[PDB]
Amino acid sequence: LGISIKVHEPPRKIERFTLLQSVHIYKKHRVQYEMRTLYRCLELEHLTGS
Amino acid sequence: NHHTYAELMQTLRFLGLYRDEHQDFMDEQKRLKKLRGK
Amino acid sequence: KNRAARVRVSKGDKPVTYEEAHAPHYIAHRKGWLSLHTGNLDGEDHAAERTVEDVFLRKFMWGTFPGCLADQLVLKRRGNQLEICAVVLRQLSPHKYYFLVGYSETLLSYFYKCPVRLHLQTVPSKVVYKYL
Amino acid sequence: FNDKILNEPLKHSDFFNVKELFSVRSLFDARVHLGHKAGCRHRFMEPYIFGSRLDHDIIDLEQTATHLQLALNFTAHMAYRKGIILFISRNRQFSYLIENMARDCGEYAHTRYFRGGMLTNARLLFGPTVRLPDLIIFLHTLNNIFEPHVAVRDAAKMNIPTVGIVDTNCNPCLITYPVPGNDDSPLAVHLYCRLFQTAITRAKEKRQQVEALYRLQ
Amino acid sequence: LNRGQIIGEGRYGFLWPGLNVPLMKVQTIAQRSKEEQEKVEADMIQQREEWDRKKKMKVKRERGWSGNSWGGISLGPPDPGPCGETY
RNA sequence: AUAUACCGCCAUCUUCAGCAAACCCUGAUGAAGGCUACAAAGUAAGCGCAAGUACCCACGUAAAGACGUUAGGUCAAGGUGUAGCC
Ligand SMILES: [Mg+2]
Ligand SMILES: [Mg+2]
Ligand SMILES: [Mg+2]
Ligand SMILES: [Mg+2]
Ligand SMILES: [Mg+2]
Ligand SMILES: [Zn+2]
Numbered sequence: 348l349g350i351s352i353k354v355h356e357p358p359r360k361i362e363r364f365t366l367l368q369s370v371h372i373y374k375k376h377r378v379q380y381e382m383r384t385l386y387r388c389l390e391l392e393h394l395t396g397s
Numbered sequence: 398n399h400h401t402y403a404e405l406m407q408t409l410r411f412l413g414l415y416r417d418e419h420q421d422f423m424d425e426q427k428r429l430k431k432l433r434g435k
Numbered sequence: 436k437n438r439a440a441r442v443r444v445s446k447g448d449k450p451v452t453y454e455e456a457h458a459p460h461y462i463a464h465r466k467g468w469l470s471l472h473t474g475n476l477d478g479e480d481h482a483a484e485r486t487v488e489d490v491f492l493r494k495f496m497w498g499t500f501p502g503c504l505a506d507q508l509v510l511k512r513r514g515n516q517l518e519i520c521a522v523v524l525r526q527l528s529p530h531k532y533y534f535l536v537g538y539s540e541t542l543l544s545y546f547y548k549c550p551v552r553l554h555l556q557t558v559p560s561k562v563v564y565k566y567l
Numbered sequence: 568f569n570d571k572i573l574n575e576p577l578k579h580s581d582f583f584n585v586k587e588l589f590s591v592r593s594l595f596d597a598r599v600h601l602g603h604k605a606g607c608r609h610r611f612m613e614p615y616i617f618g619s620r621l622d623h624d625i626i627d628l629e630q631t632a633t634h635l636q637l638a639l640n641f642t643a644h645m646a647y648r649k650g651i652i653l654f655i656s657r658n659r660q661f662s663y664l665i666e667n668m669a670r671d672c673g674e675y676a677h678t679r680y681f682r683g684g685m686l687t688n689a690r691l692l693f694g695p696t697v698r699l700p701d702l703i704i705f706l707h708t709l710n711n712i713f714e715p716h717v718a719v720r721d722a723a724k725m726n727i728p729t730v731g732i733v734d735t736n737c738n739p740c741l742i743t744y745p746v747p748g749n750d751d752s753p754l755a756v757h758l759y760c761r762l763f764q765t766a767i768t769r770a771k772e773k774r775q776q777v778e779a780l781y782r783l784q
Numbered sequence: 785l786n787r788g789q790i791i792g793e794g795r796y797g798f799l800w801p802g803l804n805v806p807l808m809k810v811q812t813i814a815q816r817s818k819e820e821q822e823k824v825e826a827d828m829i830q831q832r833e834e835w836d837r838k839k840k841m842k843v844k845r846e847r848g849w850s851g852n853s854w855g856g857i858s859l860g861p862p863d864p865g866p867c868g869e870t871y
Numbered sequence: 872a873u874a875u876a877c878c879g880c881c882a883u884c885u886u887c888a889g890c891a892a893a894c895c896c897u898g899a900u901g902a903a904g905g906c907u908a909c910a911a912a913g914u915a916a917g918c919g920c921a922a923g924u925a926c927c928c929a930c931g932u933a934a935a936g937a938c939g940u941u942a943g944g945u946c947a948a949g950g951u952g953u954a955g956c957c
Contacts (some may be wrong), residue, residue, distance in 0.1 A: 413794025
């Protein structure tokens, strides 16, 4: 469709957060989950609204 | 809500579309308690 | 000894599928997340309602399609649209299936105010990955 | 029904005429008659021991000739019946020659480490349908360790016949055709492999000739 | 547990066109009466009790040398060879 | 009320490497045992260590670590057997 674009990728963010492995005691044994989010920048220059 | 989530499944067991296994197990074991005990 | 999604190796007559042969330290590695929604990305709202909604669908679908799920479910979300991948054994009659298809399609859409589209896939038996 | 030639050499005696392949003069220059020290002698080989000269056993070659003439008849019959003849050795001096003498004919050898339960557990070691071997030629019935070979027990176990060059050290009691004499001289095993090739190569072509004739009739 | 519960069955005795009836011929949402459900319910309890008394059915175990002892118990004629050799 | 009925989740030896179905063999066919590469009875799917994978790599750190032991810890995360109250 003829649009002057450019593509680059911003830095990725991981939010790593922790919680207990057992249900009772053994607080010294955890388990950690992480959530990734991966970005993609998709600039679109000089185009009509419609 | 936990009332619409529960009453719907209870009436769907009663109508015969949802087959809740935990309620299949629980009242049958209650019947086995009422056959001997009670 | 961690015991999370491990099926414990006992005897050579345990047939398991691919998703439950794998422990939860494989989920990005050798598995995939069975539910697919945008709530967990950061920062974005409305995460909790959609996870409770998804745990409702898996309890609902395993009851109303009784004894004939082979695997767990796949839930996909595309905005105001959610579809359900389910593999079903070819045991019940397809007439009995096609009733419970549209019953689910309209009941869950009227429940969650969203046009759902459950798309099944037949299988003769449960597909076996590891004879433990 | 081709069961004429399956029983026709059985009525004969020396059908393949194998007694022309050798003589006791041909064994004496092959040094078959030499044995170990008289202190290194198995108790069951004294029937075939002629005597002892200077603490050295000499094997009674007119009794070895009778044994070998029937042993060659047996392996010639077993090769004429298109059977599987397997050559077992553990001497490491002639293991090149023995695989050569299996490859020159159409038969098989085994001269390396005998894996445990090779003949008894064949249904599991190989695929579950295997034609188990039906004649075993032991060229050296001892291991490198001077103990009797485990296959002379396992082939007696699996109800398959064994011929074998029994020496003054080794047990003859499970060898169904013991062939007494030397086996530890290279001239001995060179005569033995040539004899066991010539007795079976006659048999294969004799199978081809008589079956082509009974196609002609 | 989950053997006699067909997927047509409900406590509120109802009928559907797709299942629980002979298929598509009556094509309307009907219910049983309470006085028709009273017979199907007690029939299903009776068939569960039938399966229970078949579960509580004493098997005629033969006697080898004793009860509660593997004496002269004859087992089956042995397993075949995987290439023949019936015994 | 019982963690001495359990599921569920973990601790520990674990900074381990073993466990093992189905066979075969030796012990006069006893419980058992099965090791010798110049090799004498072991063959073994499967699981685990291992390899791959994550982070900054090939390293390191995490993750992983079976089968079992301690009737280890939890009926109070939740469910649930049995016993109890209404
Ligand atoms: Mg841990
Ligand atoms: Mg008794
Ligand atoms: Mg760790
Ligand atoms: Mg590892
Ligand atoms: Mg305790
Ligand atoms: Zn010798």
